[PDB]
Amino acid sequence: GALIKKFFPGKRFQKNYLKDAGKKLKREGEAAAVEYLSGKQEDHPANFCPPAKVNILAQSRPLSEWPINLVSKGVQEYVYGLTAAEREANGDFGTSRKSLDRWFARTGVPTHGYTTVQGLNLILRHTFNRYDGVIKKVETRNEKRRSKATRINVSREADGLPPIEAEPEETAFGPDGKLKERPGINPSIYCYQQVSPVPYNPAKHPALPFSGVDPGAPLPLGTPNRLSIPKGQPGYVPEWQRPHLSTKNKRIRKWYARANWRRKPGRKSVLDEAKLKEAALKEAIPIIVTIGKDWIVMDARGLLRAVYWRGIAKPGLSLKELLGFFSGDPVLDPKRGIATFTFKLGAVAVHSRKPTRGKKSKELLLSMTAEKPHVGLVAIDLGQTNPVAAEFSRVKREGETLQAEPLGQIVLPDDLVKDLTRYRRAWDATEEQIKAEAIVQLPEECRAEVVKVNQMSAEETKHLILDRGVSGDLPWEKMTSNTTFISDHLLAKGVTDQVFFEKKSKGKKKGTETVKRKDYGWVKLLRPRLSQETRKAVNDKTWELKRASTEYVRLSRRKTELARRCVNYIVRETKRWTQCEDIAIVIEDRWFIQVLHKAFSDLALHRGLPVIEA
RNA sequence: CGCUUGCUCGGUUCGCCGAGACUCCC
DNA sequence: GGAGAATTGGCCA
DNA sequence: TGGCCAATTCT
């Protein structure tokens, strides 16, 4: 079907339609594909299917004991562990009953009665391609290291460079033929069509403590009017809170929400996990997946929130219609005790674009201004005393030339920088704490070396300069970082004749330069750089001690949450200032800089907003 | 115009309330 | 690296 | 007949 896309000028369709067209091409007739694709000639099809997450309410047996789990575990522990050469050997794979047989039979992979082609195909594809993913990730890391080394050499060529003999390692590949058993056994269960979720029905399903609802009946709504709830009962809003309530259509929380009872520095209330769970289980929306003789029941309220906050579905829909906005192939992971759904290809109207550079950035504006004769822009300035600064503009269309209109510049609000700085003080505490804890767990000689190198300061490094008989006089005031004065410092005691020289380069032009060694260059030749043996050890140890931290895992999520909050603010006032729905962001190539740049660049992937890198 | 679970940050009279993220996984 | 669904087929009451 | 849980097949 891809080859004959010629009849359609430029238009690109969705993936499922393309596969169906290929089916209609390989099968009887050829004009069937043309007629099928006729009437659907979108130029910006929906490419993105966001995730939705649900909790697990009940289950027959723990997910580890299911036959599907044991078969997938065997397949994974088998493929993750043969040599890289033999992966292509026994990788017959196939996608059929005949091909899956003679594969599960000639290999020592015991099926536990599981013989479903769909589940087995998912298992085999995911296992083999995760095995390929780890090796291509090793290749990617090696390529990134090579590029970084080349850039480091190029930069070091300009100034006085110490020898840089980076430790040579090729692809990991393990020591023996076995590539790597690095891929952990994924406990997640990948569901398929024949076990797709359905509304819980007491007649055809096991009896559980909670109760179901009529699949066709509209799903229950929340509390209709909280202000009508009487005193002495849950949900009661006291009178001193009624005036200063919210007015925006915010998400409504039940009184048994854990966000209202969680332990907090200033609550002085009593949390009852059992009582809250008992109250919360009564108003669930159960959905059940049956694989073989086993089942798990999930709460569909997460799907309901996903469809509400995105504005795809208004209140009044049913459980059958709510399930119809999601694919019937969720992922059941036992570790979190949740399941992850994914939106259907079309439930979100998002075309994940790619950030544009240079020439293509010119034609992108012509494309957007051709459809509408106004496109809002925002120029993001990440370097300033405020985390984000933006400049707005509205671009018209005039022949081959794009117009412009500077409008205004805003800054991040004062009530948000306060949150960002309350975050910074927490991150610094955790970084210092993990550094100290690593200092505790370093070797005694390594710890002594570390405390010494931290204790060796400018004068400890300049002990050599002192050994040449000089004392700190002229660079003792800020060292004059703009210029180089270490030569004059050594001249103060007649040592400037022993100053070593750094040779500069003319760049594209041919020639070198005889220039006094810079103060920064002098420190470079003087500041010790500790041996990679201990440096790598301490850095790696800090890395895993930081990975295992129970607060670092939370602060890393707060990073992304705050960055996305800033991006959402910038896009909202970008829309409000320009009063245009089409907006394109132009972005210039501890710190919030990296997380903000990733959050801004994620827009072209998650919400289709054209991000221009310049 | 539009919001019942879960999660992050805040206030409190302890009843509840105000903002926030939602591309997830190895 | 992963995160479908239509169309078809053997199928017994 | 019509009903139903599984293989086939596609970018």
Side-chain angles (χ1 to χ4, degrees), chain A residues 378-390:
Chain A
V378 62
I380 306 285
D381 214 356
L382 299 162
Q384 184 178 2
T385 182
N386 280 126
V388 186

Side-chain angles (χ1 to χ4, degrees), chain A residues 255-263 267 269-271 276:
Chain A
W255 75 269
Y256 50 70
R258 269 195 46 100
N260 296 295
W261 303 82
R262 74 183 155 89
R263 291 305 317 211
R267 277 209 203 283
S269 186
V270 176
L271 200 160
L276 293 183

Side-chain angles (χ1 to χ4, degrees), chain A residues 352-385:
Chain A
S352 294
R353 322 177 71 110
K354 46 174 67 66
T356 185
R357 277 92 60 88
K359 176 61 65 67
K360 197 70 179 69
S361 311
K362 297 299 180 183
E363 281 93 8
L364 169 65
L365 277 296
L366 277 296
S367 301
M368 293 177 71
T369 199
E371 199 260 325
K372 289 174 57 68
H374 284 112
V375 176
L377 294 174
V378 62
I380 306 285
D381 214 356
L382 299 162
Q384 184 178 2
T385 182

Side-chain angles (χ1 to χ4, degrees), chain A residues 130-142:
Chain A
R130 162 151 172 82
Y131 185 71
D132 279 344
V134 68
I135 188 63
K136 70 185 290 182
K137 184 159 297 308
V138 177
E139 292 298 291
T140 297
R141 200 176 312 266
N142 279 339

Side-chain angles (χ1 to χ4, degrees), chain A residues 139-331:
Chain A
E139 292 298 291
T140 297
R141 200 176 312 266
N142 279 339
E143 195 272 333
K144 290 199 301 287
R145 285 215 307 110
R146 280 179 287 265
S147 54
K148 186 253 291 179
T150 56
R151 176 193 171 268
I152 281 301
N153 289 347
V154 167
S155 175
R156 257 55 164 183
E157 184 188 359
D159 208 16
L161 73 164
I164 312 283
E165 196 70 29
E167 68 275 16
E169 63 261 10
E170 54 97 19
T171 306
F173 192 62
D176 299 352
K178 315 303 168 302
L179 177 70
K180 271 296 286 183
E181 280 197 348
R182 181 55 196 81
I185 295 154
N186 188 216
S188 75
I189 292 171
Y190 293 83
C191 289
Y192 47 96
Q193 179 202 344
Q194 288 155 24
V195 298
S196 284
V198 288
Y200 167 85
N201 204 349
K204 280 73 176 175
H205 288 122
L208 277 296
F210 40 88
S211 66
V213 297
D214 192 59
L219 294 174
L221 73 164
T223 298
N225 52 2
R226 57 169 155 181
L227 279 84
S228 300
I229 298 189
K231 188 172 172 64
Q233 293 179 356
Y236 174 56
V237 178
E239 278 275 324
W240 59 267
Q241 283 179 30
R242 297 180 188 271
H244 45 96
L245 279 187
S246 175
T247 57
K248 306 296 186 291
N249 291 117
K250 65 191 287 187
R251 164 205 158 162
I252 309 149
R253 284 185 299 195
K254 306 291 278 198
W255 75 269
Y256 50 70
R258 269 195 46 100
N260 296 295
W261 303 82
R262 74 183 155 89
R263 291 305 317 211
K264 187 175 164 177
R267 277 209 203 283
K268 298 189 243 186
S269 186
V270 176
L271 200 160
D272 213 2
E273 293 83 3
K275 156 188 168 313
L276 293 183
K277 284 174 70 175
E278 183 178 1
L281 198 65
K282 291 187 179 292
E283 293 179 353
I285 318 176
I287 53 170
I288 180 155
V289 159
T290 61
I291 312 155
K293 309 191 191 309
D294 272 322
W295 53 268
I296 59 149
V297 175
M298 293 148 285
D299 194 351
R301 291 191 271 198
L303 308 184
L304 192 59
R305 188 182 80 73
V307 310
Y308 282 163
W309 81 261
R310 297 183 178 257
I312 66 167
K314 289 148 307 293
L317 78 165
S318 63
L319 193 43
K320 292 177 71 68
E321 283 178 351
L322 166 68
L323 283 196
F325 283 132
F326 303 96
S327 297
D329 307 339
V331 179

